Design a binder for this molecule. Structure first.
Ligand SMILES: CCCCCCCCCCCCC/C=C/[C@H](O)[C@H](N)CO
Ligand SMILES: CCCCCCCCCCCCC/C=C/[C@H](O)[C@H](N)CO
Lengths: 293, 246, 96, 48, 246, 293, 50
């Protein structure tokens, strides 16, 4: 009323793909020949970026199939439901090593087989189910007891075997024996952000950034989420070479922005660096073009 | 009846006559930050005209042995335009872009171009060394090239260890010199956080790859350029402060 | 609930005077009285307030923070002050 | 950062210095996350 | 109950405890350009938060033999602030200012200050020569002093041939060091044209004149400064173009 | 609804002193003594910039006066209704001066008595009523005929006595005799702007501006409105020394933003330049402070 | 100086916005602040020959 230009857009600043629930595979109805102009589903334009919708009924003399093949196992919820290796620690408690403890920062990028799965989705959100299998270097179990303290970012890290951080009046800890079935713990989504990010097209800090070696590149901290320490529960050292694998499951997963699958081999942990000298071509090399094996 | 196209944002008004089909990334228009999710307690700002213009980047010439180019967003606009002077004065930022790229050629030429946005387009050190303290890394001007836009070194793996053959999962549109001389993308704000910095975190990339090499019989225009015109929509700004170049 | 910051946490400020910032007349104007990083979990002045001590027991924090500034000068002495919060980015500014 | 807006103007026969007490707290929307062992304890000896 | 005052525009929030009574120039709040009068056919822009802040100019020290100071608006804000980067990129402009000036002194000091806005505050060559081609004229930096603000040479005639005694026809407010240490003015857009340039046409001036000289018994603060905090309201911008310094 | 912040201000972006029509002078009612605390109209605060409203009834034992003094003559409409001198031309048509024409650009600032009136108001809007009195240097009228062409900005200016511009097929011209009562013409508000401006705190152009001599300062063109030419209607020269004054009236006047009255003497036309060596003090000098003449 | 906390809310200082927050305060209560177990003592049952 005073001026129409401000009330026009504000009224028209309102919110600007109702996909169905597909329980089975997609069936098909029959189709006969159709000899007519103007109507063609083959000659699409993939250049628009769209997928061609040349359905099977629209090309050939199909039949009637009421399919029944289940699509339950292909969803993301049951695709990441498998647990998998994440890290190993080397608690070399012996005569030479006068530490008695081993700290390992959580980085699932350390091992490829779980890494390549989560690289398919750029932003993920999930709850975890960690599992700490326990054994010696010989695979032998022994009558001993371990402690597994989570050390969040900012917490005092342990310093030795008799450290005061193992009093753990606030830090969650798992006291477990080595003659025990593996310890298993559920972990929530403890990011400071709203969703995890496996990628970050920039820097954590402001200011200058050099061009000779950029070690701070591509390191978002919202996913970087502290350390995880282990000792044997003892104030004097027992001589055994320990090595505990740590496994995790992903549950209640919600992905976003699918990403292609990495083909080149991994070389580092927090950086996706390949090698220009050995480009691993995805497809195997054939003889000639017209010689399908 | 579909080949024409009229996009007008801000005082600009772009038109393309041969190219057809706007592709919208992931089927969601760009929208403002909703009330129930924002965290910046202060009021953000909505200029909506000064910043929402079609800024045109520089022309990149296409040769018969060319490799590719790429840019980063909103990094290309921090020194120029009122949007540049708005991002240097604000810690927080949110916008949704309307990409648009042009490559004019004759009906006797041939060639194609893969245009795609790449969310969170990190790059990769090109070297076989795995020494953690001596690891090869891309420089700053290589990953944040600015308004010019740097070139690739090996496009088949996107300089990130991801094969280009699978690169169509991302929103894309093909320029092909037989049917369309231009392409366009409308992309929303893609970020795991409601706002972000503008001179630290680039929201996404853009790639323009000569998949099919430009080939022409001798006796024609040899210098084919590529221009990209970019236009933010529903921009936001918050947390005013002093200037910050980088 | 408010608790005092040890904003004057400097060498050559020992004793009780760590809790007090000095204020004197300035012959030359456009002067910087004091400054401190607002980050509570970070070391610095907030180690002496409760909200910075209790924040250390947790990892992450959110929500607005507020600071008051009681003046202890005489009744007749008067003056104006500018309290400026700068968002992140560059360092603390050079001039007001 | 706290700046002198104008000055600390003083009348005669009055001290020309003073002090400010900086008191801080949290606003009503303060919310916190998972627990953490603090840093302000490094007990060495067991209390006897 | 009336001495306190809380003005908050943008992310700023100014308070004055001793000064009282906001005076509004000519009884009309600042308002946007109405639909029925604007001429700029393109859409203008309304940031309303980034620009509508309380920018603080530099402190000017008051001596016992001081003469006066003055500024020009919106000339003081063209190099600083997002408003500076917005005026350099737009040919047209409209805003309404919320002046606010501060002069702190003790209850033992004495003095007064005349604060007034001067619409279309031209200046005058100080010389008896009437030769048209050799006429004395004020320099550019003298009439457009910028963020600093120059001083007077003879304040009794305002350096324009207008006596200061009649200078209260304009909107004004007195700072007097016995009862108020501060003053404030809310001025609308005063211009015979709906929009104007920002780096050519200054809409108005401001004068801060020491009518009564600062006098204090020896043994007190000798350096009394004066700061002015300024804040545009209902700003407008139109006709985007390249940068222009001056 | 999508977000409240945009609809809140837009709804509250509406329009944010109903003075009466005063026909006569202001009367007064009686008033008695009032001896009470808390209520005082004397002790105002002129420091707030407000006018003290210490009315006569509220100070003394007044009476009842139903006034009748008319305020009709004090309004601005009848304050500028007086015509006044604006310019003179010197059409020295003789043997030596082989031009036969005289051009004068309209500038009312040339003469003080009309200038000082319009300086009281910064922005004015009015319609004019020009009057071209006509005479010789001796005050004598003669049997001759004159032409008075208005030459707007951009028009071709006349070049001589036999110039083609005097064909005036578009330019308005006044053909009048010298044995005639004065010609009188009404003129509308022909600004390119919405209102006249006697002041301009800046420059017409962009770009650099020097600091040694600023001749382009304070010259807005919206009021600068072209030239006005005169010749005697004759292709050969008649020997007479002519000098015609030009007068104007201001009608339908609407002022804005009152400005103080200039006290210092004028020295130039388009620039309000005074002299620092002779500051004309407004008040006459008295003997001492306590010696009211 | 009265000992009260200043109630200078965020809405009352700056040009704020509308935020319908969702951050949970469940973990900050005293009930779940002391819910963590922790070391208390050690004993030294040195059962040997000496
Ligand atoms: C006492 C319980 C010990 C187990 C608790 C350890 C903390 C587990 C937090 C899981 C955080 C998300 C998964 C981590 C993935 C990667 O490490 C990071 N995203 C980046 O490398
Ligand atoms: C043939 C008719 C001749 C009379 C017409 C002459 C044009 C008159 C236009 C009047 C314009 C407004 C009055 C002028 C005032 C001053 O000259 C300017 N405002 C600035 O000096």
């Amino acid at each position: 009323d005073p001026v129409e230009d401000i009330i026009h857009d504000a009224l028209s600043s309102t919110v600007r793909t109702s996909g169905q629930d597909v329980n089975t595979a997609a069936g098909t109805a029959p189709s006969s020949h159709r000899l007519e102009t103007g109507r063609v589903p083959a000659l699409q334009a993939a250049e628009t970026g769209a997928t061609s919708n040349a359905t099977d009924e629209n090309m050939i003399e199909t039949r009637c199939v009421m399919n029944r093949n289940g699509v339950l196992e292909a969803t993301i919820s049951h695709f990441f439901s498998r647990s998998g290796l994440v890290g190993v620690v080397n608690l070399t408690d012996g005569g030479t090593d006068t530490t008695g403890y081993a700290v390992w920062d959580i980085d699932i990028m350390g091992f490829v087989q779980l890494r390549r799965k989560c690289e398919m989705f750029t932003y993920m959100r999930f709850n975890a189910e960690f599992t700490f299998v326990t054994t010696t270097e010989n695979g032998e179990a022994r009558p001993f007891m371990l402690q597994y303290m989570y050390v969040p970012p900012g917490a005092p890290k342990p310093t030795g075997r008799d450290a005061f951080q193992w009093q753990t009046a606030t830090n969650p800890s798992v006291f477990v024996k080595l003659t025990d079935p593996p310890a298993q713990v559920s972990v929530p989504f403890m990011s400071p952000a709203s969703a995890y990010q496996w990628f970050y097209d920039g820097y954590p800090t402001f200011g200058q950034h050099p061009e000779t070696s950029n070690t701070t590149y591509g390191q978002c901290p919202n996913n970087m989420m502290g350390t995880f320490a282990v000792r044997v529960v003892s104030r004097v050292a027992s001589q055994l070479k320990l090595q505990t694998r740590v496994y995790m499951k992903l549950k209640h997963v919600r992905a976003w922005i699918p990403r292609p699958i990495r083909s080149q081999p991994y070389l580092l942990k927090n950086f996706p660096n390949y090698d220009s000298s050995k480009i691993t071509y995805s497809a195997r090399d054939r003889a000639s073009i017209k010689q399908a094996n | 009846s579909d080949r024409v196209a009229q996009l007008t944002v801000g005082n600009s008004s772009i038109t393309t006559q041969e190219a057809a089909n706007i592709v919208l990334a992931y089927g969601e228009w760009p929208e403002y930050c909703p009330d129930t999710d924002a965290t910046a307690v202060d009021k953000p700002t909505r200029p909506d005209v000064s910043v929402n213009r079609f800024y045109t980047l520089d022309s990149k010439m296409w040769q018969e042995n060319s490799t590719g180019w790429y840019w980063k967003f909103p990094d290309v606009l921090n020194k120029t335009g009122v949007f540049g002077q708005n991002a240097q004065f604000h810690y927080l930022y949110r916008s949704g872009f309307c990409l648009h790229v042009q490559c004019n050629a004759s009906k006797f030429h041939q060639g194609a171009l893969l245009v795609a946005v790449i969310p969170e387009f990190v790059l990769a050190g090109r070297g076989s060394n795995t020494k953690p303290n001596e690891a090869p890394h891309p420089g700053f001007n290589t990953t944040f090239p600015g308004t010019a836009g740097a070139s690739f070194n090996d496009p088949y793996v996107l300089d990130s260890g991801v094969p280009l053959s699978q690169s169509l999962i991302y929103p894309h549109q093909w320029i092909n010199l037989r049917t369309n001389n231009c392409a366009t993308i409308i992309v929303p704000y893609i970020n795991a956080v409601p706002f972000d910095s503008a001179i630290n975190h680039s929201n996404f990339g853009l790639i323009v790859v000569p998949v099919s090499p430009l080939k022409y019989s001798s006796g024609a225009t040899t210098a084919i350029p590529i221009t990209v015109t970019i236009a933010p929509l529903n921009s936001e700004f918050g947390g005013l402060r002093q200037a910050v170049s980088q | 609930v408010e608790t005092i910051l040890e904003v004057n946490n400097t060498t050559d400020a020992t004793g009780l005077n760590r809790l007090l910032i000095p204020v004197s007349a300035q012959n030359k104007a456009d002067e910087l009285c004091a400054a401190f990083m607002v980050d509570p979990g970070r070391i610095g002045p907030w180690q002496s307030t409760l909200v910075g001590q209790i924040c250390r027991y947790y990892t992450q924090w959110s929500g607005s923070l507020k600071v008051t500034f009681m003046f202890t000068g005489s009744f007749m002495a008067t003056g104006k002050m500018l309290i400026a919060y700068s968002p992140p980015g560059s360092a603390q500014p050079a001039n007001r | 950062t706290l700046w002198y807006q104008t000055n600390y103007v003083v009348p005669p026969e009055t001290p020309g210095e003073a002090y400010i007490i900086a008191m801080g707290a949290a606003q009503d929307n303060f919310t916190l996350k998972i627990c953490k062992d603090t840093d302000e304890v490094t007990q060495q000896a067991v209390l006897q």
